[PDB]
Amino acid sequence: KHTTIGFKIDRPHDKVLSSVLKNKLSTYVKESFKFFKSGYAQKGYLGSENDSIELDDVANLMFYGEGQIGTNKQPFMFIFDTGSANLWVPSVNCDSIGCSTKHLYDASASKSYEKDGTKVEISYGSGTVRGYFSKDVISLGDLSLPYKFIEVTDADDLEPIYSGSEFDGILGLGWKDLSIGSIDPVVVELKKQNKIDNALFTFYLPVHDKHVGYLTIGGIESDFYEGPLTYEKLNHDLYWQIDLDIHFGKYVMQKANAVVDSGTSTITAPTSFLNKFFRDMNVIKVPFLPLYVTTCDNDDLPTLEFHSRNNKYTLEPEFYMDPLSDIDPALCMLYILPVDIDDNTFILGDPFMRKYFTVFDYEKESVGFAVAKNL
Amino acid sequence: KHTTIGFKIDRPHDKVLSSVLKNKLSTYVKESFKFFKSGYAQKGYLGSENDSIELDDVANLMFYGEGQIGTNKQPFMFIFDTGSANLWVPSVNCDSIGCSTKHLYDASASKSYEKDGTKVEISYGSGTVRGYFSKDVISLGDLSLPYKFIEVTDADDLEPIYSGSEFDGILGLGWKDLSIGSIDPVVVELKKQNKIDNALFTFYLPVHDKHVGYLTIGGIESDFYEGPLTYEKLNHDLYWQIDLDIHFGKYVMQKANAVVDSGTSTITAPTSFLNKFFRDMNVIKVPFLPLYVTTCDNDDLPTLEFHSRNNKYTLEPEFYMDPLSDIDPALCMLYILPVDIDDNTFILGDPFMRKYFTVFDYEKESVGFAVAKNL
């Protein structure tokens, strides 16, 4: 009924596990864990100021390569960003060495191009791009619309991520125009132009395949979930985040800020909060590897809880643990990592959304949750 | 000619390595080193706020020799400690668990015992003993004098080192500190009572028997050194501390304070200074073990230099490293540790004393160094 587009996910731990096998670091990982099990060193290690998780360690990049712009169907690889409204592609006029390997946009080749030319710059966490506004028809599956996007002519300040990544541009699934302008995100614009039923999108992330996800635009496919669909009002005008009381075992943070983001590869929690939980659960960090590890048969590990005013969400260990099958199947890595955004911000990333189908509704200014149906 | 007393030497790294072996951590040590010298993550690794060197446990060298008290010459093993000015033995009145295996002083069995009874608490490293003052005849080699010392009645806070080591008490070869007590240390008192030629003592650690050393009291034995013997005036009133410019390869600290110490198993250096040197030399800390390791075939390791106003002392790599023969004979441990004791302060412990015959002169308020005679 509603347009569904498949995407692929670049899982950050895949290159880490690859490196571990390639550099013969399996024994190092195993002995590191064994060392805290030898009881020699008392504490159990959870990292340091220099040995800590960074935002890049939890970036779950969502790639979509079927989008096209203009009458001559110019192809691009996009990544999704749930944190902003902007859509941009690199210009044929971009002279950056980063642009030399990308699919470029050529306005002169599209009969539906409409000039704007207003100079603009936008900044992400990984850097800044500059260019100017342009309008043309963007196609995403069976949806097409004239849309005002940014044509990037300078991507020098998006280094080293840009030249080292396989995307051309970014497609915004958030609220905030990062520029001086106030351009609606593409899902809102689709609704404004009467091309979809409602200004909403959903994420279905199949539990059986962690490298794929599905984005549905314009309405809810009930085949994706079972049981109640429940909504939580956003606690912010510009981001998909909500208020939740969050329980990690006996540790509770009341009225936490929970960001819902399929672009984050793990659950994240404030470092001080998570370290108390991990210490109790005999979880350790492998020194200078982005890996938190415990035994798979660890029967202290609880079902996480997330309480709103009216609803209660839970996440069983099977969703936030995965065995290190190529190292030692008795050892599991955890998909809960420490990230300090502020005092009370958690991110409900990929593992949460493998259990819960999610609805992002611009009209209702709410996120909806339902237990995903595994197909 | 002058009184020479032999002593046993207890080096703390032997206990560390025995524990590594017993706990089957040899592979952990080797793989940890292989990980970090590989430089995969960074040019690590040198510890952190959550992986630190603890001075008192890690580097507690013990020289211990025989002494007697009382007219029935009750025998004790004393630590010969240049960092303190107290003399104490455990009392028959000590009911501490740790005292149950020690030689205990019995005042009632000595005709020359004179009561005092003033109660005191004195500290050593992270530990303290409590007891009270007594006076009796102390015998050291062929010397004998009436002396005021402490009978310890509570050694509970000197655990676990007390019950884990062979010594009974401690003999102070340091300076009187009136904020602790007013008793002149035994070597000063011996000269006061005209029982030795001069208020000085020396240490000789012959290389041909590494588990034994020699304390000489009252004068300098020519048999123990070769070449010139040069003195350095103390730059402190309470400690055997001197002013040096110190070279660790290309890293130079001007106006360093260096304490010569019979209770320290390593050279110690300020962390920021030493870490620069270790990074350059591919020296790595084994995480959560007090071991700094490199390959034995490391040709970059330099002869350390110690410059005073008039003299220059040096310490070749042979003195500050040793192969880890029972773990991996291709790896060597370094006897240099990062400890922040105070501004610009280094300790010259065992590795320095193994090259240099050392003279501690109370009258000249100086230390003296000469190359020790070893065939």
C-alpha to C-alpha distance for B151 and B90, rounded to whole angstroms: 6
Q: Is B81 annotated as catalytic?
A: yes
Structural domain containing residue A322: 223-375
Are B156 and B301 in a shared domain? no
Phi, psi of B209 (to 5 degrees): -145, 95
| 3-state DSSP assignment of residue A74 | strand
**Residue B344 lies inside a defined structural domain of this protein:** yes
Asked if the Cβ–Cβ distance from A28 to B24 is below 8 Å, we say: no
Q: And the tokens for A110?
A: 């599209």
**Residues of B with CB below 8 A from A20's CB?**
none
Q: Are A125 and A55 in contact (CB under 8 A)?
A: yes
CA-CA distances (angstroms) from residue B51 to A43, A51, B12? 10, 11, 19
Asked if the Cβ–Cβ distance from B34 to A19 is below 8 Å, we say: no
Reference A248, options A294, A306, A313, A311; nearest CA is A306
Give the 3-state secondary structure of chain B.
CCEEEEEEEECHHHHHHHHHHHCCCHHHHHHHHHHHHCCCCCCCCCCECCECCCHHHHCECEEEEEEEECCCCEEEEEEEECCCCCEEEEECCCCCHHHHHCCCECHHHCCCCEEEEEEEEEEECCEEEEEEEEEEEEEECCEEEEEEEEEEEECHHHCCCCCCCCCCEEEECCCCCCCCCCCCCHHHHHHHCCCCCCCEEEEECCCCCCCEEEEEECCCCHHHEEEEEEEEECCCCCCCEEEEEEEECCEEEEEEEEEECCCECCEEECHHHHHHHHHHCCCEECCCCCCEEEECCCCCCCCEEEECCCCEEEECHHHHEEEECCCEEEEEEECEEECCCCCCEEEECHHHHHHEEEEEECCCCEEEEEEECCC
CA-CA distances (angstroms) from residue B334 to A244, A287, B245, B288, B320? 52, 22, 21, 16, 6
**Residue B71 lies inside a defined structural domain of this protein:** yes
Helix (H) or strand (E) holding A225: strand A225-233
Q: Which residues pair with A89 in a beta bridge?
A: A151
| 3-state DSSP assignment of residue A31 | helix
Reference A48, options B106, B49, B316, B100; nearest CA is B49
For residue A170, the distance in angstroms to the closest alpha carbon of chain B comes to: 29
CA-CA distances (angstroms) from residue A218 to A194, A215, A221, A366? 10, 10, 10, 15
Place of tokens 């199947």: A329
Are B286 and B207 in a shared domain? no
For residue B160, the distance in angstroms to the closest alpha carbon of chain A comes to: 16
Reference B196, options B128, B141, B273, B267; nearest CA is B141
Whether A44 and chain B come into contact, CB under 8 Å, resolves to no
C-alpha to C-alpha distance for A107 and A114, rounded to whole angstroms: 8
C-alpha to C-alpha distance for B332 and B321, rounded to whole angstroms: 6
Cis geometry, peptide bond prior to residue B329 (ω within 30 degrees of 0): no
The residues after which chain A has a C–N gap greater than 2.5 Å are: none
Are A260 and A292 in a shared domain? yes
Reference B51, options A92, A40, A147; nearest CA is A40
Are B185 and B235 in a shared domain? no
Q: Which of B168, B261, B350, B361 is catalytic?
A: B261
C-alpha to C-alpha distance for B75 and A172, rounded to whole angstroms: 84
Helix B26-37 to helix B12-22 angle (10° resolution) is 100
CA-CA distances (angstroms) from residue A20 to A259, B35, B170, B371? 31, 10, 51, 50
For residue A51, the distance in angstroms to the closest alpha carbon of chain B comes to: 9
C-alpha to C-alpha distance for A75 and A84, rounded to whole angstroms: 22
Whether B41 and chain A come into contact, CB under 8 Å, resolves to yes
CA-based angle A107:A111:A116, to the nearest 5? 50
C-alpha to C-alpha distance for A293 and B339, rounded to whole angstroms: 31
CA-CA distances (angstroms) from residue A259 to A2, A312, A346, B103, B149? 26, 16, 6, 67, 68
CA-CA distances (angstroms) from residue B331 to B12, B295, B334? 19, 4, 10
Burial-class residue B262 by CB neighbours within 10 Å (0-12, 13-18, 19+): buried
CA-CA distances (angstroms) from residue A171 to A64, A74, A79, A125? 9, 15, 6, 15
C-alpha to C-alpha distance for B336 and A306, rounded to whole angstroms: 51
- Alpha helices for A183-286 (secondary structure H): 186-192, 271-280
State whether the Cα torsion A318-A322-A323-A326 is positive or negative.
Answer: positive
Q: Tell me how many residue pairs between chain A and chain B have CB atoms under 8 A apart.
A: 58
**CB-CB: which of B27, B31, B45 is closest to A288?**
B45
| 3-state DSSP assignment of residue A199 | coil
Phi, psi of A221 (to 5 degrees): -90, 110
Helix A26-37 to helix A12-22 angle (10° resolution) is 100
Reference A358, options A248, A271, A263; nearest CA is A263
Within 312-371 of A, beta carbons closer than 8 Å to B belong to none
Single out the residue in B201, B222, B243 at which a domain terminates.
B222
**Residues of B with CB below 8 A from A31's CB?**
25, 27-28, 31-32
Q: Is A14 annotated as catalytic?
A: no
Q: Which of A81, A177, A243, A350 is catalytic?
A: A81
Whether B36 and chain A come into contact, CB under 8 Å, resolves to yes
Q: And the tokens for A336?
A: 């809960």
Q: And the tokens for A222?
A: 């009930």
Q: And the tokens for B135?
A: 């006076």
Whether A18 and chain B come into contact, CB under 8 Å, resolves to no
Are A146 and A274 in a shared domain? no
C-alpha to C-alpha distance for B306 and B253, rounded to whole angstroms: 10
Q: Are A151 and A132 in contact (CB under 8 A)?
A: yes
Q: Are A32 and A234 in contact (CB under 8 A)?
A: no
Length of chain A: 375
Reference B264, options B199, B351, B185, B340; nearest CA is B351
Whether B35 and chain A come into contact, CB under 8 Å, resolves to yes
For residue B25, the distance in angstroms to the closest alpha carbon of chain A comes to: 7
Reference B335, options B327, B7, B45, B348; nearest CA is B348
Whether B51 and chain A come into contact, CB under 8 Å, resolves to yes
Burial-class residue A4 by CB neighbours within 10 Å (0-12, 13-18, 19+): middle
Whether A31 and chain B come into contact, CB under 8 Å, resolves to yes
Phi, psi of B133 (to 5 degrees): -75, 145
- Mutate which: B17, B20, B22, B31, vs A, most A CBs within 10 A: B31
Pairing outcome for strands B328-334 and A78-81: unpaired
Asked if the Cβ–Cβ distance from B31 to A34 is below 8 Å, we say: no
C-alpha to C-alpha distance for A63 and A201, rounded to whole angstroms: 16
Q: How many CA atoms lie within 13 A of A93 on its CB side?
A: 12
Question: Least CA distance to B19: which residue of chain A?
Answer: A40
| 3-state DSSP assignment of residue A36 | helix
Task: Please spell the DSSP secondary structure of A271-298, one letter per residue.
Answer: HHHHHHHHHHTT-EEPTTSS-EEEETT-
**Residue B2 lies inside a defined structural domain of this protein:** no
Q: Which of A136, A168, A261, A361 is catalytic?
A: A261
Q: Are A367 and A358 in contact (CB under 8 A)?
A: yes
Are B181 and B289 in a shared domain? no
Are A171 and A305 in a shared domain? no
Asked if the Cβ–Cβ distance from B288 to A23 is below 8 Å, we say: no
- Alpha helices for A281-373 (secondary structure H): 317-320, 350-355
C-alpha to C-alpha distance for B177 and B332, rounded to whole angstroms: 39
Helix (H) or strand (E) holding A34: helix A26-37
Are A119 and A228 in a shared domain? no
Asked if the Cβ–Cβ distance from B50 to A47 is below 8 Å, we say: yes
Number of domains in chain A: 2
CA-CA distances (angstroms) from residue B315 to B297, B305, B344? 18, 7, 19
**Residues of A with CB below 8 A from B40's CB?**
19, 23, 25, 288
Are A299 and A256 in a shared domain? yes
Phi, psi of B29 (to 5 degrees): -65, -45
DSSP state of A340: -
Neighbours of B278 (CB within 10 A): 23
Q: And the tokens for A277?
A: 């939980």
Single out the residue in A198, A222, A246 at which a domain terminates.
A222
Are A117 and A171 in a shared domain? yes
**Residue A260 lies inside a defined structural domain of this protein:** yes
Whether A290 and chain B come into contact, CB under 8 Å, resolves to no
C-alpha to C-alpha distance for A265 and A186, rounded to whole angstroms: 24
- Mutate which: A37, A51, A52, vs B, most B CBs within 10 A: A51
**Residue B150 lies inside a defined structural domain of this protein:** yes
**Residue B32 lies inside a defined structural domain of this protein:** no
CATH number at residue B108: 2.40.70.10
Cβ neighbours of residue A284 under 8 Å, at least 6 residues apart? A32, A33, A36, A44, A45, A46, A278, A292, A293, A294
C-alpha to C-alpha distance for A278 and A256, rounded to whole angstroms: 19
Asked if the Cβ–Cβ distance from A27 to B25 is below 8 Å, we say: no
Question: Least CA distance to A27: which residue of chain B?
Answer: B31
Are B229 and B256 in a shared domain? yes
Whether A279 and chain B come into contact, CB under 8 Å, resolves to no
| 3-state DSSP assignment of residue A331 | strand
| 3-state DSSP assignment of residue A82 | coil
CA-CA distances (angstroms) from residue B194 to B144, B145, B189, B218, B304? 11, 10, 9, 10, 40
Whether B31 and chain A come into contact, CB under 8 Å, resolves to yes
Asked if the Cβ–Cβ distance from B25 to A41 is below 8 Å, we say: no
| 3-state DSSP assignment of residue A218 | coil
Q: Are A351 and A320 in contact (CB under 8 A)?
A: yes
| 3-state DSSP assignment of residue A132 | strand
For residue A48, the distance in angstroms to the closest alpha carbon of chain B comes to: 6
Whether B132 and chain A come into contact, CB under 8 Å, resolves to no
Identify the experimental approach. X-ray
CA-CA distances (angstroms) from residue B125 to A226, B18, B167? 65, 23, 16
**CB-CB: which of A25, A31, A51 is closest to B48?**
A51
Asked if the Cβ–Cβ distance from A31 to B36 is below 8 Å, we say: no
Question: Least CA distance to B50: which residue of chain A?
Answer: A48
Radius of gyration of chain B (CA): 21
**Residue B41 lies inside a defined structural domain of this protein:** no
Single out the residue in B172, B189, B222 at which a domain terminates.
B222
**Residue B7 lies inside a defined structural domain of this protein:** no
Cβ neighbours of residue B205 under 8 Å, at least 6 residues apart? B9, B213, B214, B350, B353, B354, B372
- Alpha helices for A158-307 (secondary structure H): 186-192, 271-280
Neighbours of B95 (CB within 10 A): 12
CA-CA distances (angstroms) from residue B27 to A32, A119, A128, B23, B132? 10, 60, 46, 11, 49
Whether A129 and chain B come into contact, CB under 8 Å, resolves to no
Are B296 and B184 in a shared domain? no
Q: Are B259 and B348 in contact (CB under 8 A)?
A: yes
Neighbours of A132 (CB within 10 A): 17
Reference A360, options A234, A246, A249; nearest CA is A234
| 3-state DSSP assignment of residue A101 | helix
Neighbours of A262 (CB within 10 A): 26
C-alpha to C-alpha distance for A302 and A281, rounded to whole angstroms: 9
